[PDB]
Amino acid sequence: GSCKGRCFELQEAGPPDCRCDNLCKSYSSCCHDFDELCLKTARGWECTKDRCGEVRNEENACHCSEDCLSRGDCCTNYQVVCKGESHWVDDDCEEIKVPECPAGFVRPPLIIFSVDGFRASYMKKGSKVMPNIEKLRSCGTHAPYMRPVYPTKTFPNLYTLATGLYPESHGIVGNSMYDPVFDASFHLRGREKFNHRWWGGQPLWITATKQGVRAGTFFWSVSIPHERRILTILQWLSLPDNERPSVYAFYSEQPDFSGHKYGPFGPEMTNPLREIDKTVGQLMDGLKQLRLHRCVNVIFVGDHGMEDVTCDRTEFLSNYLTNVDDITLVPGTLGRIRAKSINNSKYDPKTIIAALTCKKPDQHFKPYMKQHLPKRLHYANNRRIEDIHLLVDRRWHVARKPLDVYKKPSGKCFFQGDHGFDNKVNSMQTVFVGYGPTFKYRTKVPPFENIELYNVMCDLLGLKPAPNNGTHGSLNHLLRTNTFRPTMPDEVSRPNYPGIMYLQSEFDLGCTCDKGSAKERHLLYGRPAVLYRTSYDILYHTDFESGYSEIFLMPLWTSYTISKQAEVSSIPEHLTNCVRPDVRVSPGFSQNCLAYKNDKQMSYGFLFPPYLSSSPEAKYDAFLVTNMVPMYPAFKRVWAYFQRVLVKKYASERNGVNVISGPIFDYNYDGLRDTEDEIKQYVEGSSIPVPTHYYSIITSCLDFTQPADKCDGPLSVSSFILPHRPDNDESCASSEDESKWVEELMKMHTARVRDIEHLTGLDFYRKTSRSYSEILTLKTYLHTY
Numbered sequence: 001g002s003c004k005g006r007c008f009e010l011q012e013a014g015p016p017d018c019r020c021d022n023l024c025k026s027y028s029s030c031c032h033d034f035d036e037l038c039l040k041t042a043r044g045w046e047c048t049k050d051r052c053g054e055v056r057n058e059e060n061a062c063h064c065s066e067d068c069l070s071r072g073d074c075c076t077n078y079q080v081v082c083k084g085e086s087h088w089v090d091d092d093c094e095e096i097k098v099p100e101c102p103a104g105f106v107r108p109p110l111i112i113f114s115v116d117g118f119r120a121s122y123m124k125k126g127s128k129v130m131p132n133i134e135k136l137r138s139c140g141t142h143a144p145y146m147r148p149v150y151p152t153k154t155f156p157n158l159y160t161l162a163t164g165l166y167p168e169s170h171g172i173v174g175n176s177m178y179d180p181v182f183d184a185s186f187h188l189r190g191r192e193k194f195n196h197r198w199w200g201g202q203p204l205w206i207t208a209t210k211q212g213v214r215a216g217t218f219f220w221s222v223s224i225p226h227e228r229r230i231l232t233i234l235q236w237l238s239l240p241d242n243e244r245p246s247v248y249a250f251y252s253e254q255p256d257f258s259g260h261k262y263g264p265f266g267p268e269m270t271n272p273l274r275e276i277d278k279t280v281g282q283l284m285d286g287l288k289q290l291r292l293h294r295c296v297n298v299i300f301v302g303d304h305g306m307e308d309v310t311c312d313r314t315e316f317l318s319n320y321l322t323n324v325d326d327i328t329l330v331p332g333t334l335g336r337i338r339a340k341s342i343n344n345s346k347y348d349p350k351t352i353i354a355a356l357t358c359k360k361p362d363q364h365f366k367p368y369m370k371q372h373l374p375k376r377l378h379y380a381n382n383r384r385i386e387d388i389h390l391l392v393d394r395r396w397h398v399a400r401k402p403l404d405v406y407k408k409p410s411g412k413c414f415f416q417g418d419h420g421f422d423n424k425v426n427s428m429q430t431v432f433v434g435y436g437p438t439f440k441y442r443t444k445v446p447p448f449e450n451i452e453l454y455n456v457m458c459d460l461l462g463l464k465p466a467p468n469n470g471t472h473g474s475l476n477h478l479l480r481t482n483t484f485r486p487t488m489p490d491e492v493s494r495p496n497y498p499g500i501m502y503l504q505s506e507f508d509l510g511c512t513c514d515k516g517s518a519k520e521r522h523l524l525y526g527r528p529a530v531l532y533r534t535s536y537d538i539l540y541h542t543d544f545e546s547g548y549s550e551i552f553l554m555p556l557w558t559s560y561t562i563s564k565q566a567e568v569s570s571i572p573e574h575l576t577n578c579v580r581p582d583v584r585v586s587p588g589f590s591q592n593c594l595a596y597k598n599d600k601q602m603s604y605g606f607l608f609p610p611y612l613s614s615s616p617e618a619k620y621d622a623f624l625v626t627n628m629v630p631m632y633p634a635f636k637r638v639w640a641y642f643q644r645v646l647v648k649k650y651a652s653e654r655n656g657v658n659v660i661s662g663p664i665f666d667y668n669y670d671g672l673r674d675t676e677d678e679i680k681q682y683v684e685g686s687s688i689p690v691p692t693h694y695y696s697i698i699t700s701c702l703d704f705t706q707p708a709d710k711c712d713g714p715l716s717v718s719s720f721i722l723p724h725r726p727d728n729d730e731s732c733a734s735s736e737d738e739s740k741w742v743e744e745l746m747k748m749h750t751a752r753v754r755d756i757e758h759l760t761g762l763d764f765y766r767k768t769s770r771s772y773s774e775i776l777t778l779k780t781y782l783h784t785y
């Protein structure tokens with residue numbers, strides 16, 4: 001029928017006549033009078049001194065009559081031009097200790113101001129370009145940058161912000177994606193994205209609605225001007241108590257559109273950055289007009305950054321594969337390949353991997369089986385994530401064939417910037433600013449991941465978060481109140497402490513070789529808790545302590561401390577192939593050397609390095625069968641270099657380091673610790689499981705003037721999850737000296753301590769002088785280099 005009076009309605013029971021909401025233009029339909037009653041534009045969007053005190057001319061976009069403040073439909077500059085007040089940006093920011101909200105407000109509202117493609121570096125253009133945004137940053141809580149999820153695209157990141165899930169869990173693994181169960185494709189442009197079958201998890205607007213918290217319509221048809229969106233949000237905030245939503249969302253497609261066109265370093269970028277700042281100012285002027293500028297929590301958040309890319313820098317699969325017409329490629333700043341699924345696609349995953357592996361000297365992309373991607377990306381577990389993946393170098397593109405490159409008729413590309421690269425790339429980092437009563441005042445917080453924001457916004461709204469992948473409590477330092485109180489998880493499996501129980505006479509099944517007060521110097525942060533049911537033993541030695549699993553026949557963790565001045569010894573010739581039985585552990589619960597001799601592809605290594613033994617007598621402990629783990633010979637090149645060369649180097653740089661190393665089983669690549677039933681590989685003819693990865697947590701003192709074992713204040717951690725591979729094809733320069741490639745491989749596979757905890761069932765840093773919230777921040781820190 002008619003949209004009279006009910007423009008941008010939030011009807012839940014049932015709109016009477018037609019459709020009049022924000023998303024009626026794009027999807028479904030609208031009434032006929034929508035564009036006049038609801039999309040008024042007369043006089044523009046700012047008040048003139050000529051029209052101050054006007055008579056309510058309803059046809060106007062916004063009103064400058066004195067009755068506008070009652071209905072909340074004034075122009076955002078009405079108080080400034082018609083009542084002599086100042087702009088919000090011209091006021092000195094005053095510390096907001098408590099929310100200054102109207103009488104009926106039950107919780108301080110949350111407005112999410114999302115900007116598409118706002119590079120974190122844009123914040124340095126200063127107040128001459130973005131005075132409003134600079135006031136939000138300098139007076140609220142801001143990080144230097146926020147880390148998006150991989151892929152660093154719009155839809156995966158905006159939905160990750162709304163759900164707190166990795167894209168592999170909430171389902172929006174890309175702007176483009178194919179679902180084999182649906183047998184359909186999903187795209188930014190289309191009506192398919194409106195179908196609810198694509199969206200997993202529980203987004204914030206659903207979490208709020210299910211718990212009684214009203215949410216305004218987060219989305220807007222593209223034909224709704226930004227000034228009308230701001231005016232609509234301010235009109236909703238003037239609704240009565242029983243109808244007023246508590247959470248709102250404003251999304252701007254800029255500066256993404258200009259960043260794509262002119263690049264991130266173009267002088268033209270100051271024009272859209274000014275228009276965004278004016279939209280922010282219109283919102284803050286409108287909130288000050290409603291006296292809500294010291295009541296509402298405002299989150300100025302971006303989805304991803306922006307990198308200089310050009311048509312010039314494009315890699316083509318036709319330069320690597322013989323036939324590219326039998327595969328489908330999701331191209332651009334990333335690569336996802338799948339079979340055309342025709343009758344005879346004739347397609348082999350690792351054959352295509354092999355054809356893409358280290359073929360050109362300056363190759364600007366690397367192929368991966370999705371299971372072998374760096375575990376920090378968490379982009380391996382979804383039916384919509386193809387098995388083959390390409391990590392594209394920053395500043396570069398990957399395409400199927402050269403004809404796919406679209407350029408202007410002139411000798412110039414259509415785009416100068418793009419986005420979607422690895423989320424540790426500095427140009428992909430985006431902006432986070434929190435401004436309001438619940439956020440801290442003039443506070444700078446360390447960079448963090450956007451998966452953590454859903455928990456925070458649930459805390460800001462009094463909502464119990466749906467199960468997600470943020471670490472609840474790791475961002476408490478952002479808020480001045482309403483924090484979540486994290487609890488250290490209960491230990492599930494309690495260790496045995498075995499003494500000398502066996503005679504060594506019923507031992508050495510194929511092997512040959514020619515307590516608690518001195519090991520505390522190696523277990524600085526308490527023993528890790530085993531959060532799953534298992535049987536395991538604590539083993540003490542002069543140089544290291546270990547939690548040996550009687551089930552997996554190997555330690556779950558091995559802890560030891562190396563000092564700045566520790567000297568590296570070699571492995572003696574008479575001890576190179578020495579393995580000694582451990583009289584504390586039953587022979588039936590120990591590994592045996594017969595299995596390694598029979599397994600022609602599996603060697604063995606040691607979790608504690610014999611290279612760092614404190615004395616010749618102590619070195620015999622490092623060769624115990626309980627310190628031994630299965631290791632491919634190709635992996636031993638990485639492990640031996642790390643143990644012999646890098647541990648000493650790190651200890652000399654960081655004034656000593658404490659190292660915790662152990663195995664990882666993830667055969668179903670869900671990022672979670674495997675049970676026995678899921679382990680799919682053992683050492684030949686034995687029950688010794690093979691780890692898919694090996695982790696190490698290298699902790700030292702943040703204050704490098706104090707040694708690692710005498711550290712007072714905060715800790716400095718760098719962890720990694722190295723893939724246990726029978727080859728080093730991931731490292732193109734592995735033929736050269738290990739000093740050229742081993743550390744580059746380890747930096748690529750950096751990881752959160754939290755990532756290691758998901759994959760092991762262990763819980764670290766349980767005995768520290770720091771608060772648990774501070775430790776949760778430590779566990780969620782990524783050394784990106």
Ligand SMILES: *[C@@H]1O[C@H](CO)[C@@H](O[C@@H]2O[C@H](CO)[C@@H](O[C@@H]3O[C@H](CO)[C@@H](O)[C@H](O)[C@H]3NC(C)=O)[C@H](O)[C@H]2NC(C)=O)[C@H](O)[C@H]1NC(C)=O
Pocket residue numbers: 165166169201378467468469670671672758
């Ligand atoms: C990111 O968060 C996700 C939760 O939002 C985690 O995914 C969850 O993993 C759980 C592992 O047990 C699944 O539990 C299953 O729940 C169903 C309920 O009907 C039951 O089968 C079982 O309780 C359980 N299944 C098994 C085999 O134990 C959750 O279903 C699952 N959640 C979703 C939404 O899929 C991710 O693991 C987590 N990612 C990381 C890296 O930690």
Ligand SMILES: CC(C)CCC[C@@H](C)[C@H]1CC[C@H]2[C@@H]3[C@H](O)C=C4C[C@@H](O)CC[C@]4(C)[C@H]3CC[C@]12C
Pocket residue numbers: 023026193194195196197199200201202203206219220221222
């Ligand atoms: C590009 C513009 C036209 C805007 C497009 C908006 C579009 C992506 C939005 C509009 C409606 C959204 C769905 C709706 O809010 C409800 C749900 C249920 C919830 O449990 C999961 C998310 C889902 C399906 C929303 C997905 C995003 C939609 C389609």
Ligand SMILES: [Ca+2]
Pocket residue numbers: 665666667668669670671672673674675678
């Ligand atoms: Ca698993």
Ligand code: NA
Pocket residue numbers: 596597598599600601602603
């Ligand atoms: Na062998």
Ligand code: NA
Pocket residue numbers: 728729730731732733734735
């Ligand atoms: Na190689």
Ligand SMILES: [Zn+2]
Pocket residue numbers: 035036039040041
């Ligand atoms: Zn119009």
Ligand SMILES: [Zn+2]
Pocket residue numbers: 128129270
């Ligand atoms: Zn300038």
Ligand SMILES: [Zn+2]
Pocket residue numbers: 116117153154155256303304
């Ligand atoms: Zn975007």
Ligand SMILES: [Zn+2]
Pocket residue numbers: 117154256260419
């Ligand atoms: Zn973009």
Ligand SMILES: [Zn+2]
Pocket residue numbers: none
């Ligand atoms: Zn094979």
Ligand SMILES: [Zn+2]
Pocket residue numbers: 335336337370385386387388389390
């Ligand atoms: Zn892929």
Ligand SMILES: [Zn+2]
Pocket residue numbers: none
């Ligand atoms: Zn015998």
Ligand SMILES: [Zn+2]
Pocket residue numbers: 663664665666673674759760
């Ligand atoms: Zn495991």
Ligand SMILES: [Zn+2]
Pocket residue numbers: 373374375376720721722723748749750751
């Ligand atoms: Zn990794």
